[PDB]
Amino acid sequence: ASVTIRNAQTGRLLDSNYNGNVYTLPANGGNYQRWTGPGDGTVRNAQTGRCLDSNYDGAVYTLPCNGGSYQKWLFYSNGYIQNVETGRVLDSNYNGNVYTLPANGGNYQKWYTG
Ligand SMILES: OC[C@H]1O[C@H](O[C@@H]2[C@@H](O[C@H]3[C@@H](O)[C@H](O)[C@@H](CO)O[C@@H]3O)O[C@H](CO)[C@@H](O)[C@@H]2O)[C@@H](O)[C@@H](O)[C@@H]1O
Ligand SMILES: OC[C@H]1O[C@H](O[C@@H]2[C@@H](O[C@H]3[C@@H](O)[C@H](O)[C@@H](CO)O[C@@H]3O)O[C@H](CO)[C@@H](O)[C@@H]2O)[C@@H](O)[C@@H](O)[C@@H]1O
Ligand SMILES: OC[C@H]1O[C@H](O[C@@H]2[C@@H](O[C@H]3[C@@H](O)[C@H](O)[C@@H](CO)O[C@@H]3O)O[C@H](CO)[C@@H](O)[C@@H]2O)[C@@H](O)[C@@H](O)[C@@H]1O
């Protein structure tokens, strides 16, 4: 019932912790790198239960699930993962920071989810 979310540019996996930090790390087989989608648009960490979330400033974090639009995501067939509220797309770098930015076509904004 859970998937990994892997960056097409870096190969690192979307990951998060109990404090709500979101980051990418190389694959390690743990459950903090796994995510569920229960059908309401949310992307929930398999380990912590918290929902992937972001703001207009481009911060990405996890928070307890609150039913708001900032916790809803749209997965495109081309690999973009877009915040429903802000319209910004999930992005990450070689350092492992995660953020959102306007879509720009680069592979840092493309993800393989499965
Ligand atoms: O440490 C126990 C935990 O290890 C693995 O989980 C990974 C681990 O990451 C460390 C560290 O590698 C990393 O630099 C920072 C994030 O940038 O987080 C931690 O300091 O622990 C975090 C959660 O605390 C995980 O997100 C990460 O995948 C993995 O072996 C896991 O199964 C195990 O419980
Ligand atoms: O405040 C109205 C907004 O609330 C809910 O969205 C959440 C909200 O979080 C607060 C605060 O709880 C949070 O700690 C910080 C960031 O950690 O941000 C906010 O000050 O606002 C952020 C965006 O600013 C959302 O990401 C977060 O889920 C939710 O009821 C939402 O629909 C509503 O508009
Ligand atoms: O740097 C060349 C890179 O540009 C485009 O990728 C974006 C770029 O973003 C910067 C910066 O715009 C932003 O302020 C911070 C976060 O707020 O992120 C980056 O520092 O670089 C990163 C990767 O290092 C990308 O994730 C981001 O989308 C894009 O044209 C890309 O193909 C190109 O290599």
From Swiss-Prot:
Which residues does UniProt call coiled coil? Answer: none
Chloroplast is among the record's keywords: no
Q: Where are the annotated sequence repeats, by residue?
A: 1-38, 39-76, 77-114
**One GO term of the biological process aspect:** regulation of defense response to virus
Domain annotation Ricin B-type lectin: ranges: 1-114
- List, in alphabetical order, the Gene Ontology terms for molecular function in this entry: carbohydrate binding
User: Could you tell me the superkingdom of the organism this chain comes from?
Assistant: Bacteria
Q: What is the effect of changing Q109A?
A: Complete loss of HIV fusion inhibition
Keywords from the UniProt entry = Antiviral protein, Lectin, Repeat, Signal
Stretch list, region 3 X 38 AA tandem repeats: 1-114
What else the UniProt entry mentions is: Anti-HIV protein that inhibits virus membrane fusion.
**Summary of subunit composition and partner proteins:** Interacts with HIV gp120 and SIV gp130.
Its protein name is Actinohivin
State the species of origin. Actinomycete sp. (strain K97-0003)
The gene name reads ath
- Whole sequence portion shown: 47 to 160 of 160
